[PDB]
Coordinates of C-alpha atoms in Angstrom, one line a residue:
Chain A
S1 CA 0.0 0.0 0.0
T2 CA 1.1 3.6 -0.5
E3 CA 0.7 3.8 3.3
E4 CA 3.6 1.5 3.9
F5 CA 5.8 3.1 1.3
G6 CA 5.3 6.5 2.9
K7 CA 6.5 5.4 6.3
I8 CA 9.8 4.2 4.8
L9 CA 12.5 5.5 7.2
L10 CA 15.0 7.4 5.1
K11 CA 17.0 8.8 8.0
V12 CA 16.8 9.6 11.6
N13 CA 18.2 13.0 12.4
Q14 CA 20.6 14.2 15.1
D15 CA 17.6 15.4 17.2
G16 CA 15.8 12.1 16.9
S17 CA 13.3 13.2 14.3
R18 CA 12.4 10.8 11.5
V19 CA 12.5 11.7 7.8
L20 CA 10.1 9.4 6.2
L21 CA 9.8 8.8 2.4
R22 CA 6.4 10.6 2.5
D23 CA 8.3 13.7 3.6
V24 CA 10.3 13.9 0.4
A25 CA 8.0 12.4 -2.2
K26 CA 4.3 11.8 -3.3
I27 CA 3.4 8.2 -3.3
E28 CA 0.6 6.9 -5.6
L29 CA -0.5 3.9 -7.6
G30 CA 0.0 5.1 -11.2
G31 CA 1.0 4.0 -14.6
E32 CA 4.2 2.0 -15.2
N33 CA 4.4 4.4 -18.1
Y34 CA 2.2 7.4 -18.9
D35 CA 2.4 7.4 -22.7
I36 CA -0.7 5.6 -23.9
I37 CA -4.2 7.1 -23.4
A38 CA -7.1 5.5 -25.3
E39 CA -10.7 6.7 -25.9
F40 CA -13.6 4.7 -27.2
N41 CA -16.2 6.9 -28.8
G42 CA -14.9 9.9 -26.9
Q43 CA -15.0 8.3 -23.5
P44 CA -12.1 6.9 -21.4
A45 CA -11.1 3.4 -22.5
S46 CA -8.4 0.8 -22.1
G47 CA -8.0 -2.4 -24.0
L48 CA -6.0 -5.1 -25.8
Chain B
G1 CA -2.7 -33.9 25.2
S2 CA -6.0 -35.6 24.2
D3 CA -7.9 -36.9 21.2
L4 CA -10.6 -34.3 22.0
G5 CA -8.5 -31.2 22.9
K6 CA -6.9 -31.6 19.5
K7 CA -10.4 -32.0 17.9
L8 CA -11.4 -28.8 19.8
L9 CA -8.3 -26.8 18.7
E10 CA -9.2 -27.8 15.2
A11 CA -12.9 -27.0 15.5
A12 CA -12.1 -23.8 17.3
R13 CA -9.9 -22.6 14.6
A14 CA -12.2 -23.8 11.8
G15 CA -15.3 -22.2 13.4
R16 CA -17.4 -25.4 13.5
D17 CA -19.7 -24.3 16.2
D18 CA -21.7 -27.5 16.6
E19 CA -18.5 -29.5 16.7
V20 CA -17.5 -27.1 19.5
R21 CA -20.9 -27.5 21.1
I22 CA -20.7 -31.3 21.0
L23 CA -17.0 -31.1 22.2
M24 CA -18.1 -29.0 25.1
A25 CA -20.8 -31.5 25.9
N26 CA -18.0 -34.1 26.3
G27 CA -15.5 -32.2 28.5
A28 CA -12.9 -31.6 25.8
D29 CA -10.2 -29.4 27.1
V30 CA -10.7 -25.6 26.9
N31 CA -7.0 -25.4 28.0
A32 CA -5.6 -27.6 25.2
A33 CA -2.7 -25.7 23.6
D34 CA -1.3 -26.3 20.2
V35 CA 2.4 -26.5 19.3
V36 CA 3.0 -22.8 20.0
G37 CA 0.8 -22.2 23.1
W38 CA -2.4 -21.2 21.4
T39 CA -5.5 -22.4 23.2
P40 CA -8.7 -22.7 21.2
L41 CA -9.8 -19.3 22.6
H42 CA -6.6 -18.0 20.9
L43 CA -7.7 -19.8 17.8
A44 CA -11.1 -18.4 18.0
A45 CA -9.9 -14.9 19.0
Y46 CA -7.5 -14.8 16.1
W47 CA -9.7 -16.4 13.4
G48 CA -12.8 -14.3 14.3
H49 CA -15.3 -16.8 15.7
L50 CA -17.5 -14.9 18.2
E51 CA -19.9 -17.8 19.0
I52 CA -17.1 -20.2 19.9
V53 CA -15.4 -17.4 21.9
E54 CA -18.4 -17.1 24.1
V55 CA -19.0 -20.9 24.3
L56 CA -15.4 -21.4 25.4
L57 CA -15.5 -18.7 28.0
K58 CA -18.8 -20.0 29.3
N59 CA -17.1 -23.4 29.6
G60 CA -14.1 -22.3 31.8
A61 CA -11.8 -21.2 29.0
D62 CA -9.0 -18.9 30.3
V63 CA -9.5 -15.5 28.8
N64 CA -6.0 -14.4 29.9
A65 CA -4.0 -17.3 28.5
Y66 CA -0.7 -16.3 26.8
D67 CA 1.3 -18.0 24.1
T68 CA 5.0 -18.9 23.7
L69 CA 5.8 -15.2 23.4
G70 CA 3.1 -13.5 25.5
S71 CA 0.1 -13.0 23.2
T72 CA -3.3 -13.0 24.9
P73 CA -6.6 -13.7 22.9
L74 CA -7.2 -10.0 23.5
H75 CA -3.9 -9.3 21.6
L76 CA -5.1 -11.4 18.7
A77 CA -8.6 -9.9 18.7
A78 CA -7.4 -6.2 19.0
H79 CA -4.9 -6.9 16.3
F80 CA -7.2 -8.5 13.7
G81 CA -10.1 -6.2 14.3
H82 CA -12.7 -8.4 16.0
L83 CA -14.5 -5.7 17.9
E84 CA -17.2 -7.9 19.4
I85 CA -14.7 -10.5 20.5
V86 CA -12.7 -7.7 22.1
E87 CA -15.8 -6.5 24.0
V88 CA -16.7 -10.1 25.1
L89 CA -13.2 -10.8 26.2
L90 CA -12.9 -7.6 28.2
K91 CA -16.3 -8.2 29.7
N92 CA -15.1 -11.6 30.7
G93 CA -12.0 -10.1 32.4
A94 CA -9.4 -9.9 29.6
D95 CA -6.4 -7.8 30.8
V96 CA -6.7 -4.8 28.5
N97 CA -3.1 -3.8 29.5
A98 CA -1.5 -7.2 28.8
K99 CA 2.0 -6.9 27.5
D100 CA 3.5 -9.7 25.4
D101 CA 7.2 -10.4 25.4
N102 CA 7.8 -7.3 23.2
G103 CA 5.8 -5.1 25.6
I104 CA 3.1 -5.0 23.0
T105 CA -0.4 -4.2 24.2
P106 CA -3.7 -4.7 22.5
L107 CA -3.8 -0.9 22.3
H108 CA -0.5 -1.0 20.3
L109 CA -1.7 -3.7 18.0
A110 CA -5.0 -2.0 17.5
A111 CA -3.5 1.5 17.1
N112 CA -1.2 -0.1 14.6
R113 CA -3.7 -1.8 12.4
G114 CA -5.8 1.2 13.0
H115 CA -9.0 -0.2 14.6
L116 CA -10.4 3.0 16.0
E117 CA -13.4 1.5 17.6
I118 CA -11.3 -1.3 19.2
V119 CA -8.9 1.5 20.4
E120 CA -11.8 3.4 22.1
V121 CA -13.3 0.2 23.6
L122 CA -9.9 -0.7 25.0
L123 CA -9.5 2.8 26.2
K124 CA -13.0 2.6 27.7
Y125 CA -12.1 -0.5 29.7
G126 CA -8.9 1.3 30.7
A127 CA -6.2 0.7 28.1
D128 CA -3.1 2.4 29.4
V129 CA -2.4 4.8 26.6
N130 CA 1.0 5.8 27.8
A131 CA 2.2 2.2 27.6
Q132 CA 5.4 1.8 25.6
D133 CA 6.7 -1.3 23.7
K134 CA 10.3 -2.6 23.5
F135 CA 11.3 0.5 21.6
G136 CA 9.3 3.0 23.7
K137 CA 6.6 3.5 21.1
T138 CA 3.1 4.5 22.5
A139 CA 0.0 3.8 20.5
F140 CA 0.1 7.5 19.7
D141 CA 3.6 7.0 18.3
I142 CA 2.3 4.2 16.1
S143 CA -0.5 6.5 15.1
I144 CA 1.6 9.5 14.1
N145 CA 4.0 7.3 12.1
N146 CA 1.3 5.4 10.3
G147 CA -0.2 8.9 9.5
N148 CA -3.5 8.2 11.2
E149 CA -4.8 11.5 12.4
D150 CA -8.2 10.4 13.8
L151 CA -6.5 7.8 15.9
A152 CA -3.9 10.4 16.9
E153 CA -6.9 12.5 18.0
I154 CA -8.6 9.7 19.9
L155 CA -5.4 9.1 21.9
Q156 CA -5.4 12.9 22.4

């Protein structure tokens, strides 16, 4: 889940604070690639 | 060990209520433990089998049994989200502030898997919210790290 990726402990600072992955990036399910976008009769599609 | 206590461990896990009923009719062992210390209440508490939970407790099952590393059926229930079992168990005297061998508490486990109701119930029955685990984390700490703000609020 995105929730677990976000709590990835990148580094623990000198004061004890915790820099988590969610503190330095946005974490979402999303396309392996973002190149291909299909429409069937105008409306959002996918397919084979 | 007994023929029946193993049959009861099996039926408890599987949720075969009438098997459990017949087994309880025959004095099968409510204290039978499997290879790792789990009693059938454990099995029920983990696998989410409310009926059997009650039946077992009604038949002298120990609600505060603990496994090879300290887990109490409350631990299991709080952790896997079985609100009703939590309530029953605590009604029947389940130590809400039980610590396993990591110093983990049903609050911790519940905080962690984020079972807000189960948190509040446990808090209702007096879950020490300033309890710390092996590493000093309080259910709040689990809550801020998991990013759960409602939980964070409930634990104030």
